[model samples]
Target: MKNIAILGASGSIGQQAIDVIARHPESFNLISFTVGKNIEFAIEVIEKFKPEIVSVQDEADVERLKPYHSNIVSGRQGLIDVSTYEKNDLVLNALLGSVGLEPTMKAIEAGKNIALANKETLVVAGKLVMTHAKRYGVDILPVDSEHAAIFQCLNGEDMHKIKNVTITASGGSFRELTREQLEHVTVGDALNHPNWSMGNKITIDSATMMNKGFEVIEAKWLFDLKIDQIKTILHKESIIHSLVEFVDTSVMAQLGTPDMRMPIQYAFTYPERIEHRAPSLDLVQVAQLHFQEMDLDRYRCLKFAYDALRIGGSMPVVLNAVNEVAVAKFLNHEITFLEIEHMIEREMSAHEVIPDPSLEEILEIDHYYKTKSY
Candidate 1:
C-alpha cells in the first residue's frame, strides 16, 4: 500500500482524494490529513480514514478534533509538520492560497512526490518550487484537470515538437450574462457553477475566470511553456479538460465528464492507468461541443494573471494574494463580485515586481498584498 498524506482534507479536492483512496483500498494507506476549521467534516474523515497524523488551522480546531487517537497538530506550524512527515510516499496538497506554498516546498524537500491541487503555490512561487522539486528529483504531479490533461498528452511526446499548450474553461457561471448582468450578479449566482461541483471560493473564481488564469500560470511552470504559447478557449461543455497542439499540426485533447477525481486518480497512479469509479466522458450523449473565444476585457482576472506572468517574480504572488483576500471577502458578502477584480488590480498596481525572489520574499510580498487589499 502507498502511504499518502493529504493537506486540506476537508476541502473539495481533499474529500475527492479520500473517495479515490477508499475505492483503491489495497493501493493506498492514508497516513495523514489536514484541514482548516471544518471540525465536523474533519472528524468524520479522521474516524473513517484513521490516519496517523491530522492537522487543523489552529489549537481550537485541534481541540475539536482531539477525540481521535491520532497525533494532532495545529496552526501554521502544524502545516509544516504534516508536509515534512516521513511516513508518506506522496503528499496531496489541496490547501488554498499562499498557506500551501511552504508545505509544498517542505514536502518536496522531504522527498515526497507531490500531487498538487493548489494553484497559488505555483502561481506565487513557481520558480522556487519547481527549482527545488528538480533539485530533490521529486515529481510535482499536476492535480488540476487542465494540467493533468496536458501532462498526459505530453507523456511520450518530444517537447521540441510541441507547438503550444491550451486549457479550456467552462466560461464560468456568468458566461452568458451580459456585462450589465454581471454588475448585478450576486455571490450566490456566481457560485452556482454549471458543470463542476466545487467549493465556494473556486466556484467564485470560476465565475470570474480567475481559476483559468491560475491554471495558465500553472501550465507555464509545469510544461515549461512560454506565456504566449499557452492559450485558453471557452469550452462550455468542459468535457475537453485541456489540449496540446503539436508543430506537426496535430492537437491532442483529454476529455472527461467534468470530474476532479479523474485527474486526482491519474496523478496518483501515473504511467499506470487505474480503473476508477469517477464518471467517464461520453461525447455522443453530449452531442455538440461548443468552443468560444475568451474575452480578456470581459474577464479582468484572466488578463491580470497574464500581466502578472509578464511582470514575473513577486507580481504573481501579489496577484494571487489579493485575489485570495478579494475572493474571501466576496464569499463573505463583504464586497461586490466586481470588486474582486478591482481589488486585485488595485493591489497589483501598488506592488513592485521582483524579477526573481526567494520564498521568504514571495511570502513577504503575499502578506503585503493581502493586507493592502483588505
Candidate 2:
C-alpha cells in the first residue's frame, strides 16, 4: 500500500482525495494530513482514516484536537512536518496559495513523490521546484484535471514532437455575462462556478478567468513547454478536460464528467489504473459541445497571466500574489470583479522583473506584494 500524506485535507481537493483513498483500502494508506481552519473536518478525517499524524492551520485548533487524537501539529512548520513524514511514500500537496511551495520542496528533498493539486506552488516557483524534483529523482505528478488529462494524453508520446496543448476552460460562472454585467456581480454569483465545485479563491479566479491563466503557467512547468506552446480555449461543457496537439497535427484529448476525483485517484495509482466511483461520462447527455477562441481583451486576467509569464522571473509571483489579495478583497465585497484584473495588471506593470529568481527571492517578493495594497 502506498502511504499517502495530504497537505490540505480540509479543502475541496483534499476531501475528494480522501474519498479516493477510502474506496481503495488495499492500494493506499492515509498516513498523515493537514487541515486549514477546519477542525470539525479534521476531527472527521482523524476518526475516519486515523492518520498517523495531523496538522491544523492554527495552534489553538491543535490543542482542541489533542483530546480527539494525538500527534497533531499546527501552522507552517507543521505542514512541512506532515509533508516530510518518515512513513509517507507520497505527499499530496492539495493546499491553496503559495503556502504549498515550501512543503512541496521539502517533500522532494526528502525523496517523496508528489501528487500536486495545488497549482500556486507551480505558478509561483515552477522552475525551482521542478529542478529540485529532478535533483532528488522524485516524481511530480499532476492532480489538477486539466494537467492530469494532459499528463495521460502525453503517455508514451515524444515531448519533442508536441506542437501545442489546449487547456480547456468552462468559462466559469459568469461566462455568458458581458463585462458591464460583471460590474455589479456579487461574491455569491462569482463563487457559483458552473462546471466544478472549487474553493472560494479558485472560484473567483475562474469567474475572472485568471484560473485559466494560472493553468497555462502551470501547464508550461508541468509539461516543460514554452509559453506559446500552451493554449487556452473556452469549452463550456467541461466534458473534454484538455487536449494536446502533436507535431504531426494529431490531437489527443481526455474526457470526463468534470470530476476532480478521477484525476486525484489517477495521480495516486499512476502507471496503473484503478476502479473509481465517479460516474462515467455520457456523450449523449452532453450532446453539443462548443469551443470558442479565448478573447484576451474580454478576459483581461487571463491576459495578465500570459503577460506575467511572458515577462517571466518574479512577475508570475507578483501576478499570483496580487491576484490572491484582489480575489480575497472581492470575496469580502471590498472590490468589484473587474477590479481583480485591474489590480493584477497594475502590479505587473509597476514591478521590476527578476529573470531567474531563487526560492528565497520568490518567497520574499510574494510576501512583499501580498501585503502591499494595489
Candidate 3:
C-alpha cells in the first residue's frame, strides 16, 4: 500500500483525494494530513481514516483536536511536519498560494514524492524546486488537471520528439463579459464558474484568467519545456484538458469529463490505470467542441504571465505574489474585477528582475510583493 499525506485535507482537491483513497483501501493508506481552521471536519476525517497525525492552522484548534486525536501540530511548522512525515511515500500539496513552497521542498528533502496542486509554489520558485527534485531523486507528480493531462499525453514519448503542448482554458465565468461589464461584476457573479467547481480564491482567479496564467507558468516547469513551446487556447467546454504535439506532426490530447478527481487519482496511481467512479466522457453529447485563439488583450492576467515567463528571474514571483493579494482583495469586495490584473501589471512594471534567484531571494521577493502598499 502507498502511504499518503495530504497538506490541505479541508480544501477541494484534498477532500477529493480522501474520496479516491477511501475507495481503494487495498492500494492506499492515509498516514497524516493538515487542515486550516476546520476542526469539526478534521475530527470527522480522523475518525474515518485514523491518520497518524493531524496539523491545523491555529494552536487553539490543535488543543481542540488533542482530546480525540493524539498527535496534533499547529501553524506553518505544522505543515512541514505533516509533509515530511516518515511513513508517507506520497505527499499531496493541495494547500493554496505560495505557502506550499516550503512544505514541497521539505517533502523532497525527506524523499517523499509530491502530487502538487498548488501552482503558486512553482510560479514563485520553479527553478529551485525542480533543481532540488532532481538532486534528491524525487518525483514531483502534478495534481492539476491540465498538467496531469499533459503528463498522460507525453507518456512513452521522447521529450526531444515533442513540438508544443496546448493547455486548454475553460473561459471561466466571465467568458462573455466585456471590459465595461467587468468593472461592475460582484464577487458572487465572478465565483459562479461555468464549468469547473473550485474554491473561492481559485474561482475568482479563473474568472480573472490568472489561474490559467499560473498554469502556463506551471506547465513550463513540469514539462521542462521552453516558454515558446507552451501555448494556451480558449476551449470553453473544459472537456479537452490539454494537448501535446510531437515533432512528427501528431497531436495527442487527453479528454474527459470535467472532474478534478480523475487527475488526482492518476497522480496517486501513475503508469497504471484503475476504474474510476466518475462518468466516462461521451463525445456524442459533447458533439460540437469549440476552440478560439487566446485574446491576451481581453485576458490581461494571461498576458502578464506570459510576459513574466519571458522576463524570467524574479518577475514570475512578483506576478504570483501580487495576483494572490489582488485576488484576496477582490474576493473581499475591496476592488473591482479588472483591478486584479491592474494590480499585477502595476507591480510587474515597478519591480526589478533578479536573475537566477536563490530560494531565500525568491521568498524575500514574494513577501515584498505580497505586503507592498497599493
**Quick one: best TM-score, which candidate?**
3
lDDT of 1 by residue, 126-206 (tens): 888888999999999998878889999999999888899889999887888999888888876865443455467777888
Tens-digit per-residue lDDT, 176-271, candidate 3: 988788778888786654345646777877887888998999889877899899999999898899999999899999988878888889999987
- List the global CA lDDT of all models: 0.85, 0.88, 0.89
**Residue range with the least summed lDDT across 10 consecutive positions in model 2:** 190-199
Ten consecutive residues with minimal summed lDDT in candidate 3? Answer: 190-199
Please give the ranking of all candidate structures by TM-score, highest first, separated by commas.
3, 2, 1
lDDT of 3: 0.89
On lDDT, the candidate that comes out on top is 3
TM-score of 3: 0.92
Clash-forming residue pairs, model 2: none
TM-scores, all candidates, are: 0.89, 0.91, 0.92
Residue runs of model 2 more than 4 Å from their true location after superposition: 58-70, 179-198
Question: How do these models rank on lDDT, best leading?
Answer: 3, 2, 1
